[PDB]
Design a protein around this ligand. Structure first.
Ligand SMILES: NC(=[NH2+])NCCC[C@H](N)C(=O)O
Ligand SMILES: NC(=[NH2+])NCCC[C@H](N)C(=O)O
Ligand SMILES: [Ca+2]
Ligand SMILES: [Ca+2]
Lengths: 241, 238
């Protein structure tokens, strides 16, 4: 056990908290996504019993349980770029082409159910992930569907945990864009503005920022390709143990 | 003694682990299936009397692949719209005298039955039961059969080093999960007499052998998780 027996206990405790958040993120988000996946899949299959029937589509997407399980649900058509949608607070722009949206492109490309990476919603302007499913009349691609999922539980998980008064946990994208933070205004920004000179990589990093010493640990969430980050002030943490 | 109390401690650890495992697999499985059964019911409420529409929806691949069997019983014709390729309701089959129907009709909402023997597959199953409405008329009820195979895997995955095993019963003591599957369907007292279906620690004597029995209740259902060990064999191992 090399130099820093109190410093290798901090690192060990941060690793403990980091691992629980990893399991914590999986046990909430992934189990929720799995539930929402099957719901989106059945909805897609039921809808292509009569895909061009947009009245039937609106009827299904206005169904209370389905309507209350997602932020918003919609269908974009290939030929028309017509959008059937169930959000009582959103209607397409003059400029809104579904066929060039991330959930659409992914669904058409994979020819199966897809999940997008965190992007900022157009109506809500919050960062969300969307469940994308392709729609087929009968082997002919007519369009794709979006099932918006707000990352609320990520905001709750991160807020709850306090790394023994020395720091906090946070979540970024694969490109280091913050999506969950105790202070929510860091969301949408690259984590380099509140935590500069830190590489987005799994493992342990130690840096000095203007007279302060910080301990940083990153872990990945393989299924959603997110990074979970842990920061503490090593000086405060050291004296505390 | 201290060693006997350690055994009781280790049995409790395995017991609590199993309770957690049931909630982390079965309950999350039910949670996902309940949301699906609820959305499926409301979709069918667009045209409840449409036999063809119901059939085509119940035959949708993902929906048909997420349940053991899905059906709709009517209050009038007593007819059934089923999606089981290998079944067809006998003349003696009345949907409205089945557990899922009465429970769903009694309640305002979606319901989950106690584990019961499937009339067709003869397996032990639970059914998600929902009411079907038109104009706010009760026009019938639906069932969503769920196999309890994930219980068998949990129960079978336990290795207590020949000292004992874990088992699951209903609130009535009817075994629905056992390392010896031949005990499923019978009351647990058939192989474990003089044990009350109560939460807590019990020590019994059976055929010159001494056993330690510990029960825990799964509150969302009413299932009891049972933990049993041969105290002599347990002493031997640890
Ligand atoms: N609730 C909404 N904002 N719906 C429309 C946008 C859907 C999806 N987030 C997109 O940008 O394509
Ligand atoms: N797999 C089946 N065939 N299920 C239909 C018969 C049994 C069903 N649980 C009921 O009592 O309604
Ligand atoms: Ca709207
Ligand atoms: Ca049939």
């Amino acid at each position: 056990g090399p130099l820093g027996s109190v410093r290798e206990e901090i690192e060990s405790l941060v690793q403990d908290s980091l691992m629980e958040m990893v399991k914590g993120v999986k046990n909430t988000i992934e189990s929720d996504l799995a539930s929402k996946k099957g719901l989106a899949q059945s909805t897609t299959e039921i809808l292509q019993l009569d895909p061009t029937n947009k009245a039937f589509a609106k009827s299904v997407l206005e169904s209370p349980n389905l309507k209350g399980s997602f932020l918003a649900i919609g269908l974009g058509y290939e030929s028309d770029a017509t959008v059937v949608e169930n959000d009582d607070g959103w209607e397409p722009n003059a400029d809104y082409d579904p066929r060039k949206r991330p959930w659409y492109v992914d669904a058409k490309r994979e020819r199966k159910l897809v999940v997008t990476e965190p992007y900022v919603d157009i109506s809500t302007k919050k960062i969300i992930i969307s469940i994308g499913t392709p729609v087929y009349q009968q082997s002919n691609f007519v369009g794709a569907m979006f099932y918006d999922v707000e990352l609320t539980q990520l905001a709750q998980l991160v807020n709850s945990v306090n790394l023994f008064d020395a720091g906090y946990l946070f979540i970024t994208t694969k490109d280091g864009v913050t999506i969950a933070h105790p202070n929510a205004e860091n969301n949408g920004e690259k984590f380099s503005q509140f935590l500069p000179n830190v590489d987005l990589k799994e493992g342990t990093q130690r840096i000095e920022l203007d007279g302060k010493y910080y301990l940083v640990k990153f872990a990945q969430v393989p299924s959603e390709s997110w990074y979970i980050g842990a920061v503490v002030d090593e000086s405060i943490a050291f004296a505390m143990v």
